[PDB]
Design a protein around this motif. Structure first.
Motif, PDB file in Angstrom:
ATOM      1  N   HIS B  72       0.812  -1.212   0.000  1.00 34.37           N
ATOM      2  CA  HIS B  72       0.000   0.000   0.000  1.00 34.37           C
ATOM      3  C   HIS B  72       0.848   1.266   0.000  1.00 34.37           C
ATOM      4  CE1 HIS B  72      -4.125  -1.596   0.486  1.00 34.37           C
ATOM      5  NE2 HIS B  72      -3.499  -2.629   1.018  1.00 34.37           N
ATOM      6  N   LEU B  85       4.669  -0.640  11.495  1.00 40.30           N
ATOM      7  CA  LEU B  85       3.266  -0.496  11.124  1.00 40.30           C
ATOM      8  C   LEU B  85       2.515  -1.814  11.254  1.00 40.30           C
ATOM      9  CD1 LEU B  85       3.367   1.883   8.017  1.00 40.30           C
ATOM     10  CD2 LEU B  85       2.296   2.318  10.231  1.00 40.30           C
ATOM     11  N   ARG B  88       1.937  -2.437  14.986  1.00 38.50           N
ATOM     12  CA  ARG B  88       0.816  -1.644  15.471  1.00 38.50           C
ATOM     13  C   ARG B  88      -0.505  -2.173  14.920  1.00 38.50           C
ATOM     14  NH1 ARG B  88       1.651   2.885  17.972  1.00 38.50           N
ATOM     15  NH2 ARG B  88      -0.335   2.123  18.831  1.00 38.50           N
ATOM     16  N   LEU B  89      -0.451  -2.756  13.726  1.00 36.01           N
ATOM     17  CA  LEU B  89      -1.631  -3.333  13.095  1.00 36.01           C
ATOM     18  C   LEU B  89      -2.120  -4.548  13.868  1.00 36.01           C
ATOM     19  CD1 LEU B  89      -3.497  -3.251  10.481  1.00 36.01           C
ATOM     20  CD2 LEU B  89      -2.056  -5.145   9.696  1.00 36.01           C
ATOM     21  N   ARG B  90      -1.182  -5.389  14.294  1.00 36.29           N
ATOM     22  CA  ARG B  90      -1.521  -6.569  15.080  1.00 36.29           C
ATOM     23  C   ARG B  90      -2.165  -6.180  16.406  1.00 36.29           C
ATOM     24  NH1 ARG B  90       0.382 -11.529  13.772  1.00 36.29           N
ATOM     25  NH2 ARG B  90       0.171 -12.097  15.985  1.00 36.29           N
TER      26      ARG B  90
ATOM     27  N   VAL C   9     -17.448  -5.136   9.945  1.00 42.67           N
ATOM     28  CA  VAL C   9     -17.237  -3.701  10.087  1.00 42.67           C
ATOM     29  C   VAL C   9     -17.148  -3.054   8.711  1.00 42.67           C
ATOM     30  CG1 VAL C   9     -15.696  -1.879  10.882  1.00 42.67           C
ATOM     31  CG2 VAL C   9     -16.069  -3.897  12.312  1.00 42.67           C
ATOM     32  N   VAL C  92       1.429   6.037   4.677  1.00 40.91           N
ATOM     33  CA  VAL C  92       0.716   4.890   5.226  1.00 40.91           C
ATOM     34  C   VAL C  92       0.822   4.831   6.748  1.00 40.91           C
ATOM     35  CG1 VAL C  92       0.439   2.391   5.169  1.00 40.91           C
ATOM     36  CG2 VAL C  92       1.194   3.606   3.117  1.00 40.91           C
ATOM     37  N   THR C  93      -0.326   4.752   7.416  1.00 38.11           N
ATOM     38  CA  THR C  93      -0.369   4.639   8.869  1.00 38.11           C
ATOM     39  C   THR C  93      -1.395   3.598   9.303  1.00 38.11           C
ATOM     40  OG1 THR C  93      -0.747   5.818  10.953  1.00 38.11           O
ATOM     41  CG2 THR C  93      -2.052   6.488   9.042  1.00 38.11           C
ATOM     42  N   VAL C  94      -1.687   3.544  10.599  1.00 37.65           N
ATOM     43  CA  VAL C  94      -2.606   2.536  11.123  1.00 37.65           C
ATOM     44  C   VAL C  94      -3.629   3.093  12.112  1.00 37.65           C
ATOM     45  CG1 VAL C  94      -1.005   0.616  10.822  1.00 37.65           C
ATOM     46  CG2 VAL C  94      -0.976   1.928  12.933  1.00 37.65           C
ATOM     47  N   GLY C 110      -7.519  -4.033  13.523  1.00 35.32           N
ATOM     48  CA  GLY C 110      -6.533  -3.133  12.951  1.00 35.32           C
ATOM     49  C   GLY C 110      -6.763  -2.841  11.480  1.00 35.32           C
ATOM     50  N   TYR C 111      -6.593  -1.577  11.101  1.00 39.94           N
ATOM     51  CA  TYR C 111      -6.763  -1.159   9.712  1.00 39.94           C
ATOM     52  C   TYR C 111      -5.597  -0.300   9.224  1.00 39.94           C
ATOM     53  CZ  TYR C 111     -11.652  -2.743   9.524  1.00 39.94           C
ATOM     54  OH  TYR C 111     -12.800  -3.501   9.513  1.00 39.94           O
ATOM     55  N   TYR C 112      -5.251  -0.455   7.949  1.00 40.32           N
ATOM     56  CA  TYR C 112      -4.257   0.401   7.306  1.00 40.32           C
ATOM     57  C   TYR C 112      -4.918   1.640   6.710  1.00 40.32           C
ATOM     58  CZ  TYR C 112      -0.421  -2.997   7.594  1.00 40.32           C
ATOM     59  OH  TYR C 112       0.568  -3.845   8.038  1.00 40.32           O
ATOM     60  N   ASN C 114      -4.107   4.966   3.956  1.00 35.35           N
ATOM     61  CA  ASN C 114      -3.218   5.599   2.987  1.00 35.35           C
ATOM     62  C   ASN C 114      -3.669   7.012   2.629  1.00 35.35           C
ATOM     63  OD1 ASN C 114      -1.742   4.605  -0.244  1.00 35.35           O
ATOM     64  ND2 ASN C 114      -1.120   6.083   1.329  1.00 35.35           N
ATOM     65  N   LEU C 140      -8.378   0.419   3.819  1.00 32.39           N
ATOM     66  CA  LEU C 140      -8.794  -0.860   3.263  1.00 32.39           C
ATOM     67  C   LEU C 140      -9.809  -1.538   4.171  1.00 32.39           C
ATOM     68  CD1 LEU C 140      -7.090  -3.387   4.920  1.00 32.39           C
ATOM     69  CD2 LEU C 140      -5.226  -2.217   3.747  1.00 32.39           C
ATOM     70  N   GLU C 142     -10.853  -4.578   3.060  1.00 32.14           N
ATOM     71  CA  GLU C 142     -10.667  -5.929   2.550  1.00 32.14           C
ATOM     72  C   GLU C 142     -10.276  -6.909   3.655  1.00 32.14           C
ATOM     73  OE1 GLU C 142      -7.726  -5.307  -0.564  1.00 32.14           O
ATOM     74  OE2 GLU C 142      -6.157  -5.013   0.942  1.00 32.14           O
ATOM     75  N   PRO C 144      -9.187  -6.725   7.470  1.00 27.51           N
ATOM     76  CA  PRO C 144      -8.923  -6.156   8.795  1.00 27.51           C
ATOM     77  C   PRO C 144      -8.162  -7.140   9.677  1.00 27.51           C
ATOM     78  CG  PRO C 144     -11.188  -6.892   8.658  1.00 27.51           C
ATOM     79  CD  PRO C 144     -10.613  -7.045   7.278  1.00 27.51           C
ATOM     80  N   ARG C 145      -7.216  -6.649  10.471  1.00 26.33           N
ATOM     81  CA  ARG C 145      -6.441  -7.534  11.334  1.00 26.33           C
ATOM     82  C   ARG C 145      -7.117  -7.681  12.691  1.00 26.33           C
ATOM     83  NH1 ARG C 145      -3.926 -11.897   9.878  1.00 26.33           N
ATOM     84  NH2 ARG C 145      -1.685 -11.976  10.362  1.00 26.33           N
TER      85      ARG C 145
ATOM     86  N   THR D  76      -4.844 -13.991  16.252  1.00 25.56           N
ATOM     87  CA  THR D  76      -4.833 -13.040  15.145  1.00 25.56           C
ATOM     88  C   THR D  76      -5.245 -13.697  13.830  1.00 25.56           C
ATOM     89  OG1 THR D  76      -3.042 -11.784  16.199  1.00 25.56           O
ATOM     90  CG2 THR D  76      -3.470 -11.362  13.868  1.00 25.56           C
ATOM     91  N   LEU D  77      -6.254 -13.133  13.174  1.00 28.80           N
ATOM     92  CA  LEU D  77      -6.758 -13.677  11.916  1.00 28.80           C
ATOM     93  C   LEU D  77      -7.141 -12.579  10.929  1.00 28.80           C
ATOM     94  CD1 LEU D  77      -9.147 -16.458  13.302  1.00 28.80           C
ATOM     95  CD2 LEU D  77      -6.881 -16.824  12.314  1.00 28.80           C
ATOM     96  N   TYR D  78      -7.714 -12.984   9.802  1.00 28.45           N
ATOM     97  CA  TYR D  78      -8.297 -12.046   8.849  1.00 28.45           C
ATOM     98  C   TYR D  78      -9.815 -12.189   8.847  1.00 28.45           C
ATOM     99  CZ  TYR D  78      -3.661 -11.096   6.849  1.00 28.45           C
ATOM    100  OH  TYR D  78      -2.351 -10.719   6.662  1.00 28.45           O
ATOM    101  N   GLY D  79     -10.516 -11.069   8.702  1.00 25.46           N
ATOM    102  CA  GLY D  79     -11.966 -11.083   8.627  1.00 25.46           C
ATOM    103  C   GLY D  79     -12.637 -11.457   9.936  1.00 25.46           C
ATOM    104  N   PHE D  80     -13.927 -11.766   9.863  1.00 27.39           N
ATOM    105  CA  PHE D  80     -14.708 -12.083  11.053  1.00 27.39           C
ATOM    106  C   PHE D  80     -15.409 -13.432  10.925  1.00 27.39           C
ATOM    107  CE2 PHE D  80     -14.181  -7.868  12.791  1.00 27.39           C
ATOM    108  CZ  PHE D  80     -14.050  -7.068  11.673  1.00 27.39           C
TER     109      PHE D  80
END
Ligand SMILES: CC(C)(COP(=O)(O)OP(=O)(O)OC[C@H]1O[C@@H](n2cnc3c(N)ncnc32)[C@H](O)[C@@H]1OP(=O)(O)O)[C@@H](O)C(=O)NCCC(=O)NCCS
Lengths: 360, 93, 154, 81
Positions: B72, B85, B88-90, C9, C92-94, C110-112, C114, C140, C142, C144-145, D76-80
């Motif tokens: 991205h 990043l 922090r995302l985790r 979400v 890019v941040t979070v 968590g989301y990215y 831009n 995004l 698409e 989410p973490r 930790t995963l992706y989506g719900f």
């Protein structure tokens, strides 16, 4: 004939060239570890591989693989084990004129597995269908990930997909408390409630007294002797995290057959929920199907080719180390592999054509 | 050109993978950390095994998130900021 | 076994401008009525170099909680420029959406993000002074973490 | 000044771990941060496991202790779904 079995499932007007490479059932290492002071059960292995391709309709020679699936079949004096080793697509199914927008690959998998089950169903012998669902980019076709039209599922999607694949085969029998059959699913990191969400919709409308899908492990079915050490209660498939962890645990052996860090099966799976493969940020599925009933080859189509172990390995390895980045590369690799298979089987051509009849 | 390395293409994945980190360095690392926490306890070999499994899994996931973060930013090469990043995302470890 | 768990979400205004308020359509699931309420925080990380530039943009409370599937809107004010470095602001941040029951954090999404200039001309030649009225954020939805923690409820 | 074992985790291992993570290319000056994160995570897990073992009043940390330590790290995963 496998071609006939597959033809009855595919939609009407769907032309598909298939190739089915197998090997003669030969002695192998026991799928289950031997109890202390005893000998391993004699196991006969039998390799199978299905390659499904279509034509972009440039001519007739134009042929590109759209699907591939490798399945291992184990046989002992008590159990027939059908293990889905690998499964992958190239995504060039999009090239098919007037794509019917159906779950085609799901139907192909279902048909192939059904055929194997039926043709390997021994009289009064327990039959198991096991598989390990892990969502990764490409397994059999290198560079196919660079094909934009390739729809690679995620973890949840893939688990649900395999469950939907097996579900009909499961429901082709009677519920277990007149051959019976029950399905077992284990998703590391998920409780029973969260696991239930992966079951097919049909599971929502089954008998509460006699269920079909269960979030557990077929312990008292796979093993007639529950007093044996835990290491003898888990199958050791090739390229499987279960196997790797079983070896790592077996490293603790000098109590006969007893581990140190893992005392029971529950502890084993509790540990399994935190292995490198099952907790890399993606969900993972363990699927089993237990069936309990109270030229010597079934497949006769020209798509069938019985090669030696060596020649089988040669053919498969020739296929899985090709390029499928572009359409031309995929077609070229398809042709090359087809010719190599024709050579290994000492024929001028290997493979047959199938056209679907069903239209419901 | 600070020492940028292009990684070998993964032609095909596999369902089971051996741990990449060598066992002895990880063990002496764990021992060092245990010492720095001021305790007279030590880990079982199986315990250190599990530790390595978890560590490598965490690193792989974090590297996935790192790669996504680098994407991205319209780049193929991942960087330090991408790793932070991803952390922090985790949700910070 | 969680009593409360998210199901989706959906970001409503996207790609909205940077100063535009954050608006989330959040759909979660509850198994049984609870005594306390649900606390929802939305932290913007202005700079990844340190966890100090973290800004809790808004904190909301939801109580009581009906049994079953529930959807609600979550609005939060735009971050403050006086707490964000003028360099790492663009790029890019979070952002972190935190759900906690009775103060105990149990869901962390968590989301990215831009931040992009509306024109390519500004991207090629960026001004020394940040033009906030020309910066649109693109987040995004698409992948989410999502991180789920296990906590004691009542 | 003493030596640190976190600098013992060789660069090729890090590159391979990155490759497995789907990374295509990496910057030459990234290994230090990787080692930092690795050490931080492993630290936390070790703190939890050692604490749990201490409260259990046992002299050796078993693998299950590590499991119960990891259960606090969350999933930790992706989506719900
Ligand atoms: C998983 C895989 C084998 C099946 O491919 P597939 O495109 O999903 O084909 P399917 O017949 O299963 O289609 C399933 C659904 O996806 C949808 N779909 C198919 N192609 C699609 C596309 N290009 N875009 C969006 N959706 C698509 C179909 O509508 C279908 O709908 P459904 O949910 O009602 O069933 C294939 O995606 C693949 O090769 N993935 C990478 C390999 C892999 O992960 N192997 C794991 C083995 S354990």
């Amino acid at each position: 004939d496998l071609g006939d079995s597959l033809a009855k499932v595919l939609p009407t007007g769907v032309k598909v060239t298939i190739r089915h490479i197998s090997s003669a059932p030969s002695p192998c290492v026991a799928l289950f570890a031997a109890p202390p002071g005893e000998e391993p059960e004699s196991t006969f292995c039998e390799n199978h591989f299905l390659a499904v391709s279509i034509s972009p309709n440039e001519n007739e020679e134009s042929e590109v693989i759209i699907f591939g699936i490798e399945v291992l079949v184990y046989g002992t004096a008590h159990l027939t084990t059908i293990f889905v080793s690998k499964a992958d697509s190239t995504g060039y199914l999009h090239l098919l004129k007037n794509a019917p927008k159906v779950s085609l690959l799901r139907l192909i998998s279902n048909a192939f597995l059904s055929f194997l089950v039926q043709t390997h169903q021994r009289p009064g012998v327990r039959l198991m269908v096991s598989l390990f669902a892990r969502a990764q980019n490409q397994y059999l076709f290198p560079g196919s990930i660079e094909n934009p039209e390739k729809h690679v599922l995620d973890d949840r999607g893939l688990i649900k997909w395999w469950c939907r694949v097996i579900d009909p085969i499961l429901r082709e029998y009677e519920p277990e408390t007149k051959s019976s059959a029950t399905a077992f699913l284990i998703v590391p990191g998920c409780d029973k409630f969260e696991t239930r969400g992966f079951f097919p919709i049909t599971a929502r409308s089954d008998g509460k007294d006699r269920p079909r899908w269960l979030n557990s492990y077929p312990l008292h079915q796979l093993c007639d002797n529950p007093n044996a050490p835990p290491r003898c209660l888990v199958p050791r498939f090739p390229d499987d995290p279960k196997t790797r962890f079983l070896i790592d645990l077996d490293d603790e052996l000098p109590n006969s057959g007893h581990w140190r860090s893992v005392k029971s099966l529950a502890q084993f799976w509790e540990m399994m929920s935190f292995r490198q493969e099952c907790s890399a940020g993606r969900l993972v599925g363990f699927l089993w199907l237990v069936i309990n009933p109270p030229f010597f080859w079934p497949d006769t189509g020209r798509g069938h080719a019985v090669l030696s172990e060596e020649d089988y390995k040669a053919a498969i390895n020739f296929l899985i180390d090709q390029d499928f980045n572009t359409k031309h590369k995929a077609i070229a690799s398809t042709k090359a592999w087809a010719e190599k298979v024709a050579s290994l089987a000492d024929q001028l051509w290997v493979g047959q054509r199938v056209e679907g009849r069903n239209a419901t | 050109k600070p020492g940028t390395v292009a990684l070998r293409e993964i032609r095909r994945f596999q369902k089971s993978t051996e741990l990449l980190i060598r066992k002895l360095p990880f063990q002496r690392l764990v021992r060092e950390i245990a010492q720095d926490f001021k305790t007279d306890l030590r880990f079982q070999s199986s315990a250190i095994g599990a530790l390595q499994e978890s560590v490598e899994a965490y690193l792989v996931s974090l590297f996935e998130d790192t790669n996504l973060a680098a994407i991205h930013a319209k780049r193929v090469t991942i960087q330090k900021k991408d790793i932070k990043l991803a952390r922090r995302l985790r949700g910070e470890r | 076994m969680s009593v409360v768990s998210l199901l989706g979400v959906k970001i409503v205004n996207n790609p909205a401008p940077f100063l535009a308020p954050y608006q989330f359509e959040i759909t979660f699931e509850c198994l049984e009525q609870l005594q306390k309420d649900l606390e929802w925080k939305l932290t913007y990380v202005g700079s990844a170099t340190s966890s100090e530039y973290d800004q809790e943009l808004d904190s909301l409370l939801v109580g009581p909680i009906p049994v079953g599937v529930n959807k609600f809107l979550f609005e939060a004010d735009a971050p403050d420029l006086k707490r964000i470095p003028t360099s790492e602001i663009l790029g890019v941040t979070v952002i972190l959406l935190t759900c906690s029951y009775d103060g105990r954090e149990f869901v962390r999404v968590g989301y990215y993000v831009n931040n992009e200039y509306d024109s390519e001309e500004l991207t090629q030649d960026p001004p020394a002074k940040p033009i906030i009225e020309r910066i649109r954020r693109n987040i995004l939805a698409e992948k989410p973490r999502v991180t789920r923690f296990a906590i004691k409820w009542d | 000044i003493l030596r640190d074992n976190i600098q013992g985790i060789t660069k090729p291992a890090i590159r391979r771990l990155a490759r497995r993570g789907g990374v295509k290319r990496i910057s030459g000056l990234i290994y230090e941060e990787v080692r930092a994160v690795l050490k931080s995570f492993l630290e936390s897990v070790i703190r939890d496991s050692v604490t749990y073992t201490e409260h259990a009043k046992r002299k050796t940390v078993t693998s299950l202790d590590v499991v119960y330590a990891l259960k606090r790290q969350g999933r930790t995963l992706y989506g719900f779904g």
